[PDB]
Write a protein that binds this ligand. Sequence first.
Ligand code: NI
Lengths: 135, 135
Amino acid sequence: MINAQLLQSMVDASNDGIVVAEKEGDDTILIYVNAAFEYLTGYSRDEILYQDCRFLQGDDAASGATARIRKAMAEGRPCREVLRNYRKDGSAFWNELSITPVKSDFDQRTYFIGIQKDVSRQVELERELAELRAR
Amino acid sequence: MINAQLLQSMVDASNDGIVVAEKEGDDTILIYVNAAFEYLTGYSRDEILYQDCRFLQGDDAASGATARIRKAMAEGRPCREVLRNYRKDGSAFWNELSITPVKSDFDQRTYFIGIQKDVSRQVELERELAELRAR
Ligand code: NI
């Protein structure tokens, strides 16, 4: 079996962003982010934490597309969505987000694990590909 | 701050494969794999563990990266390599593998963290693109 420090290093090594949020009312707030999430978003740890992750969505709220996510979180189901998000510097990316409910023995709190991934390149590739297929 | 159970949930939730290996002679053997690594490779934990991970490489001896990885592991450097691997069922996939040395302050032994990303899709998209551009 594997100890806590190794688990930390497994998260720290990970390519995808990983985060944990605890529920605060009908919102969540980030309590942990890994290094890859910092790099992905352009924000430092200290800028990100203790806030709901929707700030990444920017000043726009899409069409409250997060409907599916809020449905799933409320219901205690995982989900995955691709969302528009914006780095610190304003540059936009497509973020493939997988959210996973956690059941906590230790306290009474509700936690969620998020795994996040830049999929811009792949979105663009599918687009370029469909364009050439159309020629 | 973050506890051990949630770290385990972060690794369990991970989309990429995560694994820990030990040195044994001039081999390394897996001692932990997450669920995603099962899915990725098609093998169960009990089939995988306690073996050097090169069996995934199949009948296809690469050279190139293997040397590079041995070099890097010996030297105690993290390293990253793309390599063809084969699931249980024979189907091939492109694995972006990053290996990270860590020393356990618990038992003073050095452990290797492996992160495995399936990058088949991107690779195939670039392939399909380069083919249509060739038309
Ligand atoms: Ni042995």
